[PDB]
Chain length 490, copies 3
């Protein structure tokens, strides 16, 4: 008769990394890093994004004639913009606080265009001005959401306009100021020199004066146009007053829906698909705590790491070599129902077996460990992306260094955690096997003979019921004291 204690081995080729060893083959493993994507731009939670195409945000809001497909725009989940859009400001100029406007748009999901100043109200001025830069079918034209005021006859009276925000939400209003190239242009367009443009709300007070100077020609013109924006609160009034050089708004954008959104810089096209996580390269469908696809992401997505491999060991170490010995020589390829178990060879045949309580405890421990590593990570809606102007380099560097530092910290945390946990579980398995061996040895006492390979040779004749009692921890030592004593002394 004979009983042996050993562990389980299979044909797996999965390897993990520990703090003491590299490339350790294991029976089972779990990957906690996602490295794949579908390479497509899809809908987020069932709502399609807003595809700007070759247009810019300023061109969309101002009403560029080449962006006429965006006159009415439905609800969106995020905005897709090209890195260097072509159709922006057709008339050369600037746009004050552009990055602030984009950041505000990062948390707006829908707009509603409202006619706040009808074009026909300017009954004392000419409202049909145009330029060759914003030309449609050769003929000169202008922005579709703005009105250009010009003298009627040889008179430019004071232009006054007001609007009381009775819409129901905050309103975004954009106006502009014209900077001509020479005094002849100023006198031909506005008939007076020394003009002003005045805009004032309950919390805003701005006055601007045109600048007349020769400038390098952009898009064929030496003139410029400066645009400004404001947010009109509910039940608040905006006033306009100008003696010349005023580009007046005809529409105002009301914030109809609010939420978490962002601007994605991409050159692709929307495709028919759905997802819950979106990256500039493609969507992610995963349930793991890490990924290394792209730092910029929109939606509820796992943390981003600069790691090419993060594998948690779950099973034992694969050292399969092997009367039949025990755990000392190596693992077993015949035990296919548990991690740790027994092996017996008596008169009524032989065979393998598997201990239940120890395997259950080890399995529960490993499951708790992996769940604790996974669920201890906070996931929220992250839309990390910001634009800075050419005079805001220090702020941009600060933002970049902050993101880089946090990324490095989390990379170090994940790597060290996995490296140490793999070593601990590998030692845990050996400790469990040794504990089972010690328990069996203590329960058997002097009635058996050790062999040095994890196997015990019995002195008495142990049948199947006695082996079952041994495996279940119900061995009756007194029942075999007299029997085993005779052979031991002989």
């Amino acid at each position: 008769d004979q009983i042996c204690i050993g562990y389980h081995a299979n044909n797996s080729t999965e390897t993990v990394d520990t703090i003491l060893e590299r490339n350790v083959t294991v029976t089972h493993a779990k990957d906690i890093l996602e490295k794949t994507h579908n390479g497509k731009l899809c809908k987020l939670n069932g709502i399609p994004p807003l595809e700007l195409g070759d247009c810019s945000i300023a061109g969309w809001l101002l009403g560029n004639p080449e962006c006429d497909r965006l006159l009415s725009v439905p609800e969106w989940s995020y905005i897709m913009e090209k890195e260097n859009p072509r159709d922006g400001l057709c008339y050369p100029g600037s746009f004050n606080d552009y990055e602030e406007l984009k950041h505000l748009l990062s948390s707006v999901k829908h707009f509603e265009k409202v006619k706040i100043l009808p074009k026909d109200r300017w009954t004392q001025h000419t409202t049909t001005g145009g330029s060759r830069a914003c030309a449609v079918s050769g003929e000169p034209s202008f922005f579709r959401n703005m009105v250009w005021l010009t003298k009627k006859g040889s008179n430019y009276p004071v232009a006054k306009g007001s609007y009381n925000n009775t819409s129901g939400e905050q309103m975004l209003i954009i106006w502009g100021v014209h900077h001509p190239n020479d005094e002849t242009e100023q006198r031909t367009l506005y008939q007076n020199v020394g003009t002003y443009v005045s805009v004032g709300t309950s919390t805003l007070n701005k006055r601007s004066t045109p600048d007349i100077a020769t400038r390098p020609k952009v898009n064929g013109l030496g003139s410029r146009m400066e645009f400004s924006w404001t947010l009109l609160d509910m039940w608040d009034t905006i006033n306009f007053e100008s003696t010349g050089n005023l580009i007046a708004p005809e529409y105002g954008f009301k914030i109809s829906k609010r939420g978490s959104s962002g601007i994605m810089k991409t050159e692709g096209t929307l495709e028919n698909c759905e997802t819950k996580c979106q990256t500039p390269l493609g969507a992610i469908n995963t349930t793991l705590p890490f990924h290394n696809v792209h730092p910029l992401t929109i939606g509820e997505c796992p943390k981003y790491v600069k790691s090419e491999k993060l594998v948690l060991a779950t099973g034992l170490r694969n050292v399969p070599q092997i009367a039949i010995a025990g755990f000392i020589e190596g693992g077993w390829q015949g035990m296919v129902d548990g991690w740790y178990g027994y092996h017996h060879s008596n008169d009524q045949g032989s065979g393998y077996a598997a201990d239940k309580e120890s395997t259950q405890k080890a399995f529960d421990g490993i499951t708790n460990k992996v769940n604790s590593v996974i669920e201890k990570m906070n996931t929220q809606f992250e839309a990390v992306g910001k634009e800075f102007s050419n005079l805001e380099r220090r702020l941009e560097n600060l933002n970049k260094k902050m993101e880089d530092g946090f990324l490095d910290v989390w990379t170090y945390n994940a790597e060290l955690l996995v490296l140490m946990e793999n070593e601990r579980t590998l030692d845990f398995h050996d400790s469990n096997v040794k504990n089972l061996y010690d328990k069996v040895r203590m329960q058997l006492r002097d009635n058996v003979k050790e062999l040095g390979n994890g196997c015990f040779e019995f002195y008495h004749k142990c049948d199947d019921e006695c082996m079952n009692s041994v495996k279940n921890g119900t061995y009756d030592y007194p029942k075999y004291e007299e029997e085993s004593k005779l052979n031991r002394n002989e």
Copy 2:
């Protein structure tokens, strides 16, 4: 004769969490998180705070007529301000670089008011202006710390004034510019059109021109007042010059004391205590590495975590059940003098004991562990809290993201550290018990018989001195070697 090796158990119900198991009952535990406060706003280090009430910082510094109780304020530890103060700028207008001024006030603990420009020196102007917006008992009034200059007769001469900073410390000076509603108001107040206000120091050069336009009525007036502030260095001069629309200062604020302070947004009223860490909800009396009361604190306070439980295990696992058995079947409820011990049973009675060396070593190790966990955390006087305007949303988002990232980093660190250290301790105790058993077995050798439940049956007769020796570590094997061989063979 029996001598058993075991550990201590009690009737505790405290539970700790490890990385392999959850809700593990322990004999002793230590809490390293505090979740309680007294809910009272009250003194920091013996210095009462500055309670503004319904007044804002701008209203206090300018001298709003509704804040006359603040015209002479003593030392303070921190400033208490409401979220939306009611008595600020009685005259509608704006304040330039308001948030920078508040940040500067975050490091000032006392002000001294110095009369730098007496009201009676303006002998060629009228210095009794007022408005219905700032009215006391119905009659018009004005800010108590500034002078409104108006034409005398029908002339407004050029106004000049200067001050040389001979006070011994840095001084804060505030001036304002008036923006009328129409030309008639400008003519009846200053008699001139196209005026300027010039303020200049060694490192400052500012000139402003009033803007005349129709604006929505706030507090009944279409006019606005714009205020600016500067910091005048020691032995430096400030120059004022204006042809109209100048609100001139009468007082200056010199920084008498400097230190660490802050602005707390609460709606409560000062009460009586003597604390050292203040939160907007209440005070904290703690000696623990962490807390979860409120993020924004003033003083030296523990690190803030988004954790509801952080308990460190400092004792053994509580297995209640135990002739008398050993550590195989569980712990003892009758050994009340230590962690690891013995239990002997000879003809002269049977009682418990306690090994002192092992218990002392384990106690020292656990104490060093907890002190290493607690004492490596750096604590310092932190006054987190900053303010941003409507046109600085990117900066606000950057600040919030930085604070949140650091908070999650520390949360993960603390939770993982506690989870691992609990397993380390629970394995340490079992290893110590195993080592004690192994040492006793090795020094006893063949003279005893094992029983598999943790204790030994003696072959000779062991009196009290022999048990004292085996506990001591000076058991004499040759003394009983001949006697032991006699009964072992039989």
Copy 3:
């Protein structure tokens, strides 16, 4: 005849720190923190720095007469500047966006000065102005890279100038505006009142008006000069137009070489030495992952921490005290071959030996642990250091807070890592020795008698070949079973 198992001891006094106990003496240890430096300012990768001396960046770029040595500066690796330089703006004034220019200079390694507007093209103006502030050898002078335009006779015509950037790279151009003290000075210099300065590029449009007011006297003058700068793109034009108060540039700075440089604030002088890492206190010459010299470094430098000691244990605990006993009583001073070994004593002699397999496994384990700790840290180039004005205190506080937080996080990480891995290394060594003892006992079975101090006593007579077989792992139990059974019973 007996054989013992023990470990290695020596005369070292190195000390390490663990999490359960402090001040542990180890046989071997590794220091991973450098605390030393040369104390000199040297050349980075063979390229000497730019020594500004008593000059500022503005003084060097504008051409202060005292800073006449920095007119043909060659390529540099980093810039050395003083905290309060003496030779800056000789004529009192300001410099708009000075900090942005200083930040841009941290990514430029060479400037080429090209003449864009020669001083002789101003045929209708006087270009020989000067002041007593910027005086050389008593006679008045001015900046060497700037031109002061004044009236010729009693006329100041419209001054126009332009330049097309055909140099081959981006250009840095600096201009200025003069602010006089009284109308008499303005009439004496420019003959016109109500002048302007206009500067325009493809993406820039600026207009300035002189300010005439009485100011405190700095350097003997009540007048100021305001300087501004731009970055001209390739194939772009800059236009200058002025009716007065224009300080036109004569040279433009071409970015000839771009890289990663920085500005170091020091009061020292350059010395003849080479280095790869530079700090304001000296140069670092290391391979270690950490240092604690100075937070601000330029080059490839280890991470900075606030620790005074970081030592990794790579050996055993030094407990030297010893028939010869084994590992129960202490280490051995005579077994200088490895870490773990045996001592044998038979009739053919006695001596010490070592087990090569276990020692090698432990050695590669410790080496792998050390390499894992050191190599996982990411290093790169970062010229840490930024400047902020007096109105940007919140931004400076944000930068300081972020840097301090990251430094604290990394210090905590390194300290806890060192403690836990030291503990695990000591436990590793103890477990290895115990495993060797268990292996020998298992292989030798009943032919030997245990003694309790790590030594076995053979029942048979074991010669040198049998001892070598025991060390080898090929001890033949049946070959000695018959003889060993005879002596044991008697």
